[PDB]
Scaffold this active site. Structure first.
Site, PDB file in Angstrom:
ATOM      1  CG  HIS A 142      -1.798  -1.098   1.411  1.00 50.84           C
ATOM      2  ND1 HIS A 142      -2.801  -1.360   0.504  1.00 50.84           N
ATOM      3  CD2 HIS A 142      -1.897  -2.050   2.374  1.00 50.84           C
ATOM      4  CE1 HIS A 142      -3.478  -2.425   0.900  1.00 50.84           C
ATOM      5  NE2 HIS A 142      -2.950  -2.859   2.029  1.00 50.84           N
TER       6      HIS A 142
ATOM      7  CD  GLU B  76      -3.245  -3.017   5.772  1.00 51.35           C
ATOM      8  OE1 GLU B  76      -4.289  -2.598   5.252  1.00 51.35           O
ATOM      9  OE2 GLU B  76      -2.688  -4.084   5.426  1.00 51.35           O
TER      10      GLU B  76
ATOM     11  NE  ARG C 254      -5.545  -7.464  -5.817  1.00 51.03           N
ATOM     12  CZ  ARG C 254      -6.466  -6.801  -6.496  1.00 51.03           C
ATOM     13  NH1 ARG C 254      -6.234  -6.430  -7.746  1.00 51.03           N
ATOM     14  NH2 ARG C 254      -7.617  -6.502  -5.919  1.00 51.03           N
TER      15      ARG C 254
HETATM   16 ZN    ZN Z   1      -3.388  -5.024   3.212  1.00 53.10          ZN
END
Ligand code: ZN
Length: 315
Positions: A97, A115, A192
């Site tokens: 990310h 996160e 990704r």
């Molecule tokens: Zn993640």
């Protein structure tokens, strides 16, 4: 405002999803492959709607923009966080990310996505992919191109109760057999690098973002360090998992009756186990596994009576 604001869950199908959200939380899900429950969300792609009170029906975005007093008048163009319940039946994609700068520059103002994960439950031999061995970006590129996932990826064995902080720029992936409460910045920015060559419900492969992932990825990888703390008072044990730049996350383990105060700008709360009764002033609010709610800036001191476990966060 001075009363709990409950949120109605939003769901997202995933090739790696399952039915655990229905089986363990009683939720009505969209498909038998539901991977995510966007539990406290103000993200445009799936915002939570207020489930009770005067604001019933409004989205969390409308609350942030029209009723900031609820959030203690804090600054920001958008509600800052996003909380999800993840049913990781199969492996998720290997990804990275971006941080706020890269996301804003390349994803049209989208926030970055630092996160963290609280492992609610998982199978005995469960793992996660966290970090890598590449010493340079050319090396990372080379190892990804030869699909040498074995030499590149770093893996960590996990168990229920574990907590992992995932700074943006970290190459990672949750792996099969895990039930997670994920607290993240309000963003859907994901690059990704590998998805096991799988096909989605529409027979098409999922999008990969090789260049962007390499650009956003931190190389070399260095494991960060977080110190946890635990304290107990009558009726409750509180574990502090992290107090970071983007959020602070805690676990409230309640047994009996606990006396609480809401001294932050607002508290984001998810009941992950049990049930209980929240009482404040002359009001009563039943709580149960699967409820997600925000305690506003002016929330009065309150008590929670019962045997329940909540994961709570704030900025
Ligand atoms: Zn993640």
């Amino acid at each position: 405002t001075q009363s709990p604001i409950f949120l109605t869950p939003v769901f997202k199908e995933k090739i790696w999803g399952g039915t655990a959200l229905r089986d363990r939380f009683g939720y009505s899900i969209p498909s038998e492959s539901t991977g995510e429950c966007w539990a406290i969300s103000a993200h445009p792609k799936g915002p939570s709607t207020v489930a009770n009170g005067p604001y019933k029906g409004k989205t969390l975005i409308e609350l942030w923009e029209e009723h900031r007093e609820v959030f203690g008048g804090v600054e920001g163009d958008r509600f800052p966080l996003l909380t999800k319940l993840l049913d990781v039946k199969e492996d998720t994609s290997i990804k990275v990310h971006p941080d706020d700068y890269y996301a804003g520059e390349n994803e049209e103002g989208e926030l970055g996505k630092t996160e963290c994960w609280y492992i609610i439950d998982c199978k005995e031999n469960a793992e996660i992919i966290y970090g890598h061995t590449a010493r340079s970006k050319t090396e990372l590129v080379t190892m990804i191109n030869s699909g040498d996932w074995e030499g590149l990826l770093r893996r960590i064995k996990i168990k229920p109760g574990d907590f992992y902080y995932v700074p943006s720029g970290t190459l990672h992936a949750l792996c099969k057999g895990a039930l997670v409460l994920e607290t993240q910045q309000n963003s859907d920015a994901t690059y990704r690098v590998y998805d096991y060559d799988r096909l989605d419900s529409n027979g098409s492969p999922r999008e990969l973002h090789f260049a962007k992932a390499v650009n956003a990825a931190t190389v070399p990888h260095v494991d960060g360090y977080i110190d946890e703390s635990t304290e107990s008072r009558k009726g409750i044990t509180i574990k502090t998992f992290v107090q970071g730049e983007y959020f602070s996350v805690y676990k409230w383990d309640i047994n009996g009756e606990a006396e609480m105060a809401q001294d932050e700008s607002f508290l984001i709360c998810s009941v992950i186990e049990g049930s209980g009764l929240l009482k404040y002033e002359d009001k009563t609010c039943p709580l149960k596994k699967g409820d997600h709610f925000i305690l506003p800036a002016q929330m009065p001191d309150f008590t929670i009576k019962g045997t329940c476990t909540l994961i709570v966060s704030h900025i």
